[PDB]
Amino acid sequence: FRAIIESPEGAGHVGYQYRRNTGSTMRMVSDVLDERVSLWDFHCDPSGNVIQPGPNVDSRQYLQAAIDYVSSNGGGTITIPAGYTWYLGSYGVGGIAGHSGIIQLRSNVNLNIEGRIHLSPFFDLKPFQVFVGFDNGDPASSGNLENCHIYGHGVVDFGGYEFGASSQLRNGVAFGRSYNCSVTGITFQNGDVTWAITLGWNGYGSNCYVRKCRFINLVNSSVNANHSTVYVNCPYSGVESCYFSMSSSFARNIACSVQLHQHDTFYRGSTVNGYCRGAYVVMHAAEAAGAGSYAYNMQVENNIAVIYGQFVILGSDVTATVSGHLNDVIVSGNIVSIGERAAFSAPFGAFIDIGPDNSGASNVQDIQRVLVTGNSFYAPANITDSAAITLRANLNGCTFIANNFDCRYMVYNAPGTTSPVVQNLVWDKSNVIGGTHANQRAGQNLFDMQFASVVNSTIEVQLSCEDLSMFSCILFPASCQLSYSKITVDSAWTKSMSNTAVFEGNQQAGANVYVSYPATVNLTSYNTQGAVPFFSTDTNYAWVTSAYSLSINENLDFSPPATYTNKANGQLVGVGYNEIGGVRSVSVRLMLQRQV
Amino acid sequence: FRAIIESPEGAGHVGYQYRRNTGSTMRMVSDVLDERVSLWDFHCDPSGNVIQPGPNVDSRQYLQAAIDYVSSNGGGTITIPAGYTWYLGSYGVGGIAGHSGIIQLRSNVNLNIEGRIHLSPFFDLKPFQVFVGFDNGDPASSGNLENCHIYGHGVVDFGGYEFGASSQLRNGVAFGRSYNCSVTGITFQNGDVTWAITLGWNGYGSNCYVRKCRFINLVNSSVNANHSTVYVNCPYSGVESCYFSMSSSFARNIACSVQLHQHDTFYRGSTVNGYCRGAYVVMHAAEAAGAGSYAYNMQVENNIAVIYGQFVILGSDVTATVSGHLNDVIVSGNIVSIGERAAFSAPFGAFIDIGPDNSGASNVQDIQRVLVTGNSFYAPANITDSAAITLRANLNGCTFIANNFDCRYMVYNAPGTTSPVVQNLVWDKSNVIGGTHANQRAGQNLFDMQFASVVNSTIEVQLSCEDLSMFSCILFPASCQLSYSKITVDSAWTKSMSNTAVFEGNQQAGANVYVSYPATVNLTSYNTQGAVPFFSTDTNYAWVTSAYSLSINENLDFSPPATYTNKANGQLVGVGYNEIGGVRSVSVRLMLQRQV
Amino acid sequence: FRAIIESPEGAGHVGYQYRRNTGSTMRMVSDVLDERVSLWDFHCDPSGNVIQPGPNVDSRQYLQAAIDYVSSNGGGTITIPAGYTWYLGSYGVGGIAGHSGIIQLRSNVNLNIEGRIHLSPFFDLKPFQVFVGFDNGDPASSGNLENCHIYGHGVVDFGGYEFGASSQLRNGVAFGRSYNCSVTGITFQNGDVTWAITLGWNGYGSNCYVRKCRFINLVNSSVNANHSTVYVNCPYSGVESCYFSMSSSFARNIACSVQLHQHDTFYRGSTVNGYCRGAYVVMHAAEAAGAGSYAYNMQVENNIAVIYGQFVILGSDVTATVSGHLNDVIVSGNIVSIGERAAFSAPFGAFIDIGPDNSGASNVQDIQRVLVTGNSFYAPANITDSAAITLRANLNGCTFIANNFDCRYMVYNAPGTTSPVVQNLVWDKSNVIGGTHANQRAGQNLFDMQFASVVNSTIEVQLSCEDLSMFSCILFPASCQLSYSKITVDSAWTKSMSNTAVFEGNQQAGANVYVSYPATVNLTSYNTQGAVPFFSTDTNYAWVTSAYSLSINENLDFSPPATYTNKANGQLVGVGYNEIGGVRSVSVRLMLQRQV
Ligand SMILES: CC(=O)N[C@@H]1[C@@H](O[C@H]2O[C@H](CO)[C@H](O[C@H]3O[C@H](CO[C@@H]4O[C@@H](C)[C@H](O)[C@@H](O)[C@H]4O)[C@@H](O)[C@H](O)[C@H]3O)[C@H](O[C@@H]3O[C@H](CO)[C@@H](O)[C@H](O)[C@H]3NC(C)=O)[C@H]2O)[C@H](O)[C@@H](CO[C@H]2O[C@H](CO)[C@@H](O)[C@H](O)[C@H]2O)O[C@@H]1O
Ligand SMILES: CC(=O)N[C@@H]1[C@@H](O[C@H]2O[C@H](CO)[C@H](O[C@H]3O[C@H](CO[C@@H]4O[C@@H](C)[C@H](O)[C@@H](O)[C@H]4O)[C@@H](O)[C@H](O)[C@H]3O)[C@H](O[C@@H]3O[C@H](CO)[C@@H](O)[C@H](O)[C@H]3NC(C)=O)[C@H]2O)[C@H](O)[C@@H](CO[C@H]2O[C@H](CO)[C@@H](O)[C@H](O)[C@H]2O)O[C@@H]1O
Ligand SMILES: CC(=O)N[C@@H]1[C@@H](O[C@H]2O[C@H](CO)[C@H](O[C@H]3O[C@H](CO[C@@H]4O[C@@H](C)[C@H](O)[C@@H](O)[C@H]4O)[C@@H](O)[C@H](O)[C@H]3O)[C@H](O[C@@H]3O[C@H](CO)[C@@H](O)[C@H](O)[C@H]3NC(C)=O)[C@H]2O)[C@H](O)[C@@H](CO[C@H]2O[C@H](CO)[C@@H](O)[C@H](O)[C@H]2O)O[C@@H]1O
Ligand code: NA
Ligand code: NA
Ligand code: NA
Ligand code: NA
Ligand code: NA
Ligand code: NA
Ligand code: NA
Ligand code: NA
Ligand code: NA
């Protein structure tokens, strides 16, 4: 009996009944211990003796053995115990080797990480993906991962190692073709990695989430080619209530917090500091296998960010046989700023970017039905390269309502570069343009419409303070066609502006262009006492449907017309009043209107 | 000693002291095992031998025994172990029998569901409510359920069984008269049920929540009368971060995700696919016992939905002795679309519906102080039956600001049908009207004001693209009274429209009606050289306070007035200018204005 | 052997191997029991015998012993067992004694509170802070607390005791200089306390959160000086999805739910009832040591509140050597109401308050770049002291877009009192002004601009119903300078108003003031048949750049001008038309415009 009791089967001979309840199961101690499982149950030598973790012990095979066994019983939760650091020191084998995998995840096997998991210097300068849910080196031939959750108060620490080569890939958790999988509560820190977590594979997967995680200092070298902390590559998936921080200079040029790359995905309630970018919202044709060619129902909401480049980047692209489409997006409630930096020291600052594809093409995109509403954006006054929207590729629609943008440009695209075709750009009068960059805008147009064409668009400009440094509120080069559009410049704070709206190709004459903006006009009357016509000297007003005074009349003996219409020769004309006769000559600020 | 050790009291004789710490309690193994409890501790035959769960074992009595016992000790958490499916195969007894109850929940007893709970075919074609928190067949005589939480990574599977009769009810969790109760993390799937979860009872309860749950395929037959996945019937309660999906055709006609039926309730951050409806926000008089007659502080926010009917439905109704009121509602940040379907193939598509009561009455409602802001809505171009708001019953107020609606109608109600009395309908100019349905609107009015009366309302129409197919932007039949209102149609994209605003009863003449909209007007001048009057041919402008040109003047020898006022006979009149004399005749596009 | 087995080392001699797996560690029962730890493991007398908790047992030393021991092993989670109430009955010792501390928290030691923790009457009328993370009486000399989480379904009950003196402080959890600490799921109830939870210390700390907690009835006496349920005094920290309720009358005058006092902090998705205030968003100079002098990236979003005073209070202040600044704030998606109360029975009701410092100074603040968007506010019609914004101290900017405010005042500040200097106040036309207080406003100005000066501001007034009781829509006293501003009053529902906008110092004449508002004007024409001038009788219109008719013309034989400009003597003048000659005299409603 003593022998049995001291043997590994001893607990299986000690009887137990819950709280001495006579109606409860007569069990053995081992049965109750068998209800939970930890790494300690597999972290042993060939003779079954427990091995202490530490920097000179590779815990990988033990952890894999745990996962494999629990998988065999239909699943469960393995605890990685608190108060210990568990080092990983070799690559895994089989299907995950194609993915430089360390640990293979398996369906229904959750990890409750309370302790710390730390990479050993075996991985210095090498690729790695710490946890991998694919079961095949080729993801297309991989089975699925289902019902796998990683959670706890613990830590995945990437050991600080730099990348060995830019072409290398590194990841924390790749769930694979992942259905009902999640990461909750975990801190990922101290690396130079490509991603911390990836969800799904080219649209295959569903209901994957990252919640209440922290990601701290995950880029550290110039070798790192590119970093996106969470890539969401399956639908009905998202990121909520996370914290993302970088301190590296390199992160300000390369790192993004989230990629939303399939339909019905979201990014909410998170805080970001030290990153180049906030989120991509993208349909890559190359990734359309699992869930279709459309990214729709895309939500970026209630985030806080200090970034150095662009907050939300929109795009879609094509392959030889597939075309990607992006539609039905909402960006709302976010408060974002470009952090302190020199002008042009990082990628061009923006709230929204319409980004050309990875080859630079701006004529492949099919982006539409986007609503950008109730956001704040700020950039410091020196950051010339800051815009509410950098509109650098074809756009089929984007709607701005009730935002507050306080940066250098409202709408921008660089001249010379791409010439996007623009449709359904709506900038509602309820967008408030801040004043931080007042006096900085010499030579610049607030809305610099450097496009091939604009159609079915609305730009309602409303200033909230003066900025007499700007060349114009809005300017269209002669190369930009403009049709079936509404372009207005509210008069407030514009009295002293030389140019308000500028149409370098006189595009405001178009049949279906609806405009209004202030201008100064010289007029001269006839001599006649009484009701008397005033006519503009210039003849550039053939497009004007009505105009009205924005100036007081300092005279007693006459008054100019309150309102004007035009004449076939391009003059304005209205009827004023000469109390006493005489030819009058006045220079008046008018609101020019066309079909409005 | 050997006998004691092998007995069910053996663990109570093996000493233990935590980590060999001399300051720790000298305990027995059984004490430490007694700190947790699982179904295995009650899942045993009369001789105390453990019984394996499976399809031919009814786990119900064992689970009830666990709950009952733990209840007796002041509560705790029972685990339902992972890696096992636990079948339920009979009805419960006593107080829950009135509710077709299987398991009775008890206060302070939490269930940590890690495994799967599955209904056996005993329940095929029968009613059932799996977990029930009432303790009496009559809910009015029921005690409360308090501090009961169901959580975990497991699954409640309803076995796929269809309803036997439409009158049957089926539920997953009925918390009852429920205070501080919740469901977190659980997947409900594979049924034909009425509800998955219900919270509270007719206003009794508080602080009940459903968080991070999934609801998958919970309608499957034509027998199912009606389905609402979560019913929230107690205050200070809500639904957050959940996932709702249906695949059945029947779900598109019958199923709703959430009912918010008491004050201080919310529905946020959730994704819905395949449902008819998103949420009801309702005060039923019949349900006002526990928390009063007012549903206020109702929040629907930051959800993603593809539905087939209406997203948010507002209502309130009355009984012989109680009147229900709905006020102080916010609907914001939601991105919603009507899924691909034929016109009229499901209930009429809408973002907001003002729904008549269950008997069809439209004159019982008291709905007011609603804010609908910063939402997106889309319906495909063929879906004739799509509206920003279907306003089908009396409305005492609803405010729309800064939404983006892209569907067939903005405001709609069917003619012939109900004639709602409308007050305080506010449609701010910052609502962007999309263009998906451009060219589809022959015979239709964008804002079809098919009401008994409208008062204290604002409709500011702003197009963003042309749609010359529409009969009018806004139309009031002669049967609709209109007073103390503002109705404007911005001119942009309307130059070629025959009708902009239409008042079939000439209601725009009312003393306290403030309007403006474009119109084409024929004018003829007197002969006089110099300042010369132009007068409209028609005499239908007695209501007009001013009008101004929206057309250019192609002439050299004269110009029409820039502006006009009226004359008692209904003509317009203004002063233009004949450089040379002669009677002039022109047809001009004017902005007609009344008291604006 | 029997002796060993019955000894406290007995479990260390019973072998166990997980599920009889031959590849698993050969362990001893004690090893597996050692994987978890509870209060029962320390809740024992000097002889190691377990002691039952209860009202006459002080559990404090036992709980401290547990925390201390687990701390010694690098951390872990101590469970406070369900089904027991654990009373605390004495003060702690050492470093926490300076903080009236009961229990000292330690790094990496989590508490899983499933049972109830209750204060014994030893604490009646005494200060206390139940859990304290400082390790020194002087917080400046304190070490940090890291990785400390308190979570569970249990309860901290403050025993109902009143404060003994107003100067006393009481707290639930003070995390101290706290990094990666949180409270989740816990109910705090039944006290008279200063705070329930405090996070950080004067900017030191990071990543501290309070989530899914309840706070119930935490003020109960007139002695209580001040109450704020959660104070957030470290960056990258916040409050989400919590419930706050008070029932005391005193709470309506003293209690606030949240203080956000450092950068990158948030308050979201919470419900508040019975409180005076919702949140302070503040930079106290006195608290700038740990994270700088700027509070930026401040987010208050998607909350539900019934309060009696002010919802969000903004401020910043200075010390002898430090100046605090507040910028980059977003307040959105909140639905708030002032609960039923008499006028002036609690602190003045407001959605936003710009509050003077604790000494009453209104000239120390540096508050700017605030966006208040997509919120609802309501106050009952009798509550005279209700405002969208009480603007009581210097303001460097605040932007309102697309809110719905339904209360007595829009903008208010009491006359006589403070004279704030106001810059960059933007009130967009998309703010909807409700009608609840229509007919209550005798003697009152809707926008009562009781400031020293206003600059670079926009007030676009839009009514949605009539309120002829109000003295004016907007009024500027002569003492308020006004420059570089836009002030408009839309005409809708104003026809019958005697005063619309009132400039008691004729400030609308300023060179860079842009205004428009309705007025009634008497005009008289010359005799001349044909085109004929009309001139105002009054000469108060020297500032007017144009005016246009808002009235119909009931006459046949003539018409007044549609539009007007001015003359140097301050008259208006326009050209109408006498079909037949004669001097005309008319009283017309005009839209007066200046530079707009
Ligand atoms: C860091 C990051 O994610 N950046 C975004 C861009 O991602 C694109 O580049 C990445 C560079 O790291 C990825 O490519 C790299 O990795 C590929 C995948 O690795 C293979 O497959 C894995 C499943 C295995 O485990 C690996 O062992 C390996 O075999 C590899 O094929 C590439 O050669 C390599 O460079 C990223 O690739 C995606 O990664 C996810 C997550 O792991 C995976 O689920 C996908 O299957 C995989 N996709 C593809 C096509 O391989 C690759 O997409 C991203 O393109 C960009 C979006 O913005 C641009 O495009 C927009 C749309 O046109 C445009 O609007 C915008 O302006 C553009 O800048 O955003 C980040 O830069
Ligand atoms: C599926 C669903 O919930 N639909 C919504 C409507 O709910 C209404 O019909 C339901 C049909 O299933 C419910 O009625 C059914 O159930 C009743 C309750 O069951 C009894 O009581 C339980 C406590 C016991 O456990 C049961 O054993 C049983 O005894 C039963 O009395 C009815 O006879 C039966 O048809 C639903 O009833 C509510 O259910 C909740 C949750 O279980 C419960 O807490 C309530 O006490 C109970 N209420 C009542 C009054 O019984 C019943 O409300 C819902 O009416 C509708 C709202 O929209 C309509 O009304 C709006 C306001 O006028 C109007 O704006 C809109 O246009 C209308 O369509 O939304 C769903 O259809
Ligand atoms: C209840 C509450 O928090 N009210 C808010 C105001 O807080 C200010 O008053 C509080 C009164 O309780 C606090 O002061 C009290 O406590 C101080 C701290 O206790 C000391 O230090 C602790 C760390 C130890 O554990 C204690 O043992 C003790 O030694 C004490 O020094 C004060 O003497 C006492 O009155 C509150 O103090 C802060 O407390 C937090 C949390 O514990 C702590 O992290 C801070 O270090 C500590 N700060 C300071 C400076 O001591 C104190 O701040 C708050 O001022 C107000 C904001 O609104 C006003 O100011 C705005 C900006 O000018 C203005 O816009 C607005 O209109 C004003 O009303 O909001 C609440 O009233
Ligand atoms: Na690979
Ligand atoms: Na849009
Ligand atoms: Na071009
Ligand atoms: Na029943
Ligand atoms: Na409203
Ligand atoms: Na009628
Ligand atoms: Na102190
Ligand atoms: Na602002
Ligand atoms: Na002054």
Side-chain angles (χ1 to χ4, degrees), chain C residues 13-34:
Chain C
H13 288 83
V14 183
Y16 166 75
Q17 181 174 55
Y18 177 67
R19 295 192 173 201
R20 291 160 297 280
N21 172 33
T22 56
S24 275
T25 310
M26 301 175 189
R27 310 176 74 183
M28 298 285 147
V29 165
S30 62
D31 298 313
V32 191
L33 303 175
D34 285 346

Short mmCIF file of all heavy atoms in Angstrom, two decimals, chain C residues 13-34:
data_model
loop_
_atom_site.label_atom_id
_atom_site.label_comp_id
_atom_site.label_asym_id
_atom_site.label_seq_id
_atom_site.Cartn_x
_atom_site.Cartn_y
_atom_site.Cartn_z
N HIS C 13 4.01 13.36 -0.25
CA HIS C 13 4.46 11.96 -0.34
C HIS C 13 3.49 11.11 -1.17
O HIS C 13 3.72 9.91 -1.32
CB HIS C 13 4.61 11.36 1.08
CG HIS C 13 5.78 11.90 1.82
ND1 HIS C 13 5.75 13.10 2.50
CD2 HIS C 13 7.03 11.40 1.98
CE1 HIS C 13 6.95 13.34 3.02
NE2 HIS C 13 7.73 12.32 2.71
N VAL C 14 2.38 11.70 -1.62
CA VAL C 14 1.39 10.99 -2.45
C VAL C 14 1.66 11.33 -3.91
O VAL C 14 1.54 12.49 -4.30
CB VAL C 14 -0.07 11.33 -2.07
CG1 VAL C 14 -1.08 10.53 -2.89
CG2 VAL C 14 -0.29 11.16 -0.56
N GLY C 15 2.05 10.33 -4.71
CA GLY C 15 2.47 10.57 -6.11
C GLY C 15 1.29 10.80 -7.02
O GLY C 15 0.16 10.35 -6.74
N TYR C 16 1.52 11.56 -8.09
CA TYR C 16 0.49 11.89 -9.06
C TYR C 16 1.16 12.08 -10.38
O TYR C 16 2.31 12.62 -10.44
CB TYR C 16 -0.22 13.18 -8.67
CG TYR C 16 -1.07 13.78 -9.75
CD1 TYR C 16 -2.32 13.21 -10.11
CD2 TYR C 16 -0.64 14.92 -10.41
CE1 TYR C 16 -3.10 13.81 -11.07
CE2 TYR C 16 -1.41 15.50 -11.43
CZ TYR C 16 -2.66 14.94 -11.72
OH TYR C 16 -3.48 15.47 -12.65
N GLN C 17 0.48 11.59 -11.41
CA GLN C 17 0.91 11.81 -12.77
C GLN C 17 -0.35 12.07 -13.57
O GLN C 17 -1.30 11.29 -13.52
CB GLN C 17 1.67 10.60 -13.27
CG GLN C 17 2.19 10.72 -14.68
CD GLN C 17 3.05 9.53 -15.02
OE1 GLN C 17 2.61 8.35 -14.90
NE2 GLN C 17 4.28 9.78 -15.38
N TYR C 18 -0.35 13.19 -14.30
CA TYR C 18 -1.55 13.75 -14.95
C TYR C 18 -2.17 12.72 -15.85
O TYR C 18 -1.48 12.23 -16.76
CB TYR C 18 -1.18 14.97 -15.75
CG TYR C 18 -2.32 15.61 -16.54
CD1 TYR C 18 -3.41 16.23 -15.93
CD2 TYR C 18 -2.30 15.59 -17.90
CE1 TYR C 18 -4.41 16.83 -16.65
CE2 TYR C 18 -3.29 16.19 -18.64
CZ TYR C 18 -4.37 16.77 -18.04
OH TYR C 18 -5.30 17.36 -18.85
N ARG C 19 -3.46 12.43 -15.58
CA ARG C 19 -4.31 11.51 -16.33
C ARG C 19 -3.65 10.17 -16.65
O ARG C 19 -3.96 9.52 -17.68
CB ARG C 19 -4.86 12.20 -17.62
CG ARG C 19 -5.77 13.33 -17.29
CD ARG C 19 -6.59 13.91 -18.43
NE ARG C 19 -7.52 14.88 -17.87
CZ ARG C 19 -8.64 15.31 -18.42
NH1 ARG C 19 -9.01 14.89 -19.61
NH2 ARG C 19 -9.42 16.21 -17.78
N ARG C 20 -2.79 9.71 -15.75
CA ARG C 20 -2.01 8.49 -15.97
C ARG C 20 -1.19 8.50 -17.25
O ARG C 20 -0.88 7.46 -17.79
CB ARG C 20 -2.90 7.26 -15.94
CG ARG C 20 -3.48 6.93 -14.58
CD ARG C 20 -4.72 6.01 -14.74
NE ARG C 20 -5.73 6.79 -15.48
CZ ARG C 20 -6.55 7.73 -14.95
NH1 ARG C 20 -6.59 7.97 -13.64
NH2 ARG C 20 -7.35 8.42 -15.76
N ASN C 21 -0.82 9.69 -17.74
CA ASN C 21 -0.04 9.78 -18.97
C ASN C 21 1.41 9.47 -18.69
O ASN C 21 2.05 10.20 -17.91
CB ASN C 21 -0.17 11.22 -19.53
CG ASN C 21 0.74 11.49 -20.70
OD1 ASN C 21 1.03 10.63 -21.50
ND2 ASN C 21 1.25 12.71 -20.76
N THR C 22 1.96 8.46 -19.34
CA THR C 22 3.35 8.04 -19.00
C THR C 22 4.40 9.10 -19.40
O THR C 22 5.48 9.13 -18.86
CB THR C 22 3.73 6.68 -19.60
OG1 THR C 22 3.54 6.72 -21.00
CG2 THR C 22 2.87 5.59 -18.98
N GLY C 23 4.04 10.01 -20.28
CA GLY C 23 4.94 11.09 -20.65
C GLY C 23 4.86 12.29 -19.74
O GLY C 23 5.52 13.28 -20.01
N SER C 24 3.98 12.29 -18.75
CA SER C 24 3.81 13.43 -17.83
C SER C 24 4.71 13.28 -16.61
O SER C 24 5.21 12.21 -16.29
CB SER C 24 2.35 13.55 -17.36
OG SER C 24 1.59 14.29 -18.29
N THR C 25 4.88 14.41 -15.95
CA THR C 25 5.75 14.54 -14.83
C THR C 25 5.24 13.68 -13.70
O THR C 25 4.02 13.68 -13.41
CB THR C 25 5.84 16.04 -14.41
OG1 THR C 25 6.12 16.85 -15.55
CG2 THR C 25 6.91 16.28 -13.32
N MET C 26 6.15 12.95 -13.07
CA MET C 26 5.86 12.28 -11.81
C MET C 26 5.96 13.35 -10.74
O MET C 26 7.05 13.88 -10.47
CB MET C 26 6.83 11.13 -11.55
CG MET C 26 6.83 10.09 -12.63
SD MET C 26 8.11 8.88 -12.31
CE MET C 26 8.02 7.98 -13.87
N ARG C 27 4.82 13.72 -10.18
CA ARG C 27 4.76 14.81 -9.21
C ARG C 27 4.16 14.22 -7.94
O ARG C 27 3.88 13.01 -7.85
CB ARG C 27 3.83 15.92 -9.71
CG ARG C 27 4.09 16.40 -11.13
CD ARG C 27 3.06 17.44 -11.55
NE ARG C 27 3.31 18.71 -10.91
CZ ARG C 27 2.51 19.75 -11.07
NH1 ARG C 27 1.44 19.62 -11.86
NH2 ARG C 27 2.78 20.91 -10.47
N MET C 28 4.01 15.09 -6.94
CA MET C 28 3.33 14.79 -5.71
C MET C 28 2.09 15.68 -5.59
O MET C 28 2.06 16.78 -6.12
CB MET C 28 4.28 15.00 -4.51
CG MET C 28 5.49 14.10 -4.51
SD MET C 28 5.03 12.43 -4.06
CE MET C 28 6.20 11.48 -5.02
N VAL C 29 1.09 15.18 -4.88
CA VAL C 29 -0.18 15.92 -4.78
C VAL C 29 0.06 17.36 -4.35
O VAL C 29 -0.48 18.29 -4.91
CB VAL C 29 -1.11 15.19 -3.82
CG1 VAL C 29 -2.30 16.07 -3.37
CG2 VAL C 29 -1.62 13.90 -4.50
N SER C 30 0.93 17.53 -3.35
CA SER C 30 1.24 18.89 -2.86
C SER C 30 1.72 19.84 -3.98
O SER C 30 1.46 21.04 -3.90
CB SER C 30 2.30 18.85 -1.77
OG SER C 30 3.51 18.33 -2.26
N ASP C 31 2.46 19.33 -4.99
CA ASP C 31 2.93 20.16 -6.09
C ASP C 31 1.77 20.74 -6.87
O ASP C 31 1.80 21.92 -7.28
CB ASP C 31 3.80 19.36 -7.06
CG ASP C 31 5.04 18.81 -6.40
OD1 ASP C 31 5.70 19.59 -5.69
OD2 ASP C 31 5.37 17.63 -6.62
N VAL C 32 0.77 19.91 -7.12
CA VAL C 32 -0.40 20.33 -7.88
C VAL C 32 -1.27 21.29 -7.05
O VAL C 32 -1.72 22.33 -7.53
CB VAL C 32 -1.25 19.13 -8.33
CG1 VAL C 32 -2.29 19.60 -9.34
CG2 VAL C 32 -0.34 18.04 -8.87
N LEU C 33 -1.40 21.00 -5.76
CA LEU C 33 -2.13 21.95 -4.88
C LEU C 33 -1.41 23.28 -4.77
O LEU C 33 -2.07 24.34 -4.70
CB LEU C 33 -2.42 21.36 -3.52
CG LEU C 33 -3.22 20.04 -3.49
CD1 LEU C 33 -3.30 19.54 -2.05
CD2 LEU C 33 -4.59 20.06 -4.16
N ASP C 34 -0.07 23.23 -4.84
CA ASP C 34 0.77 24.45 -4.76
C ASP C 34 0.61 25.39 -5.97
O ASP C 34 1.04 26.54 -5.85
CB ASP C 34 2.23 24.09 -4.58
CG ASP C 34 2.58 23.62 -3.17
OD1 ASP C 34 1.75 23.81 -2.23
OD2 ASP C 34 3.67 23.07 -3.01
#
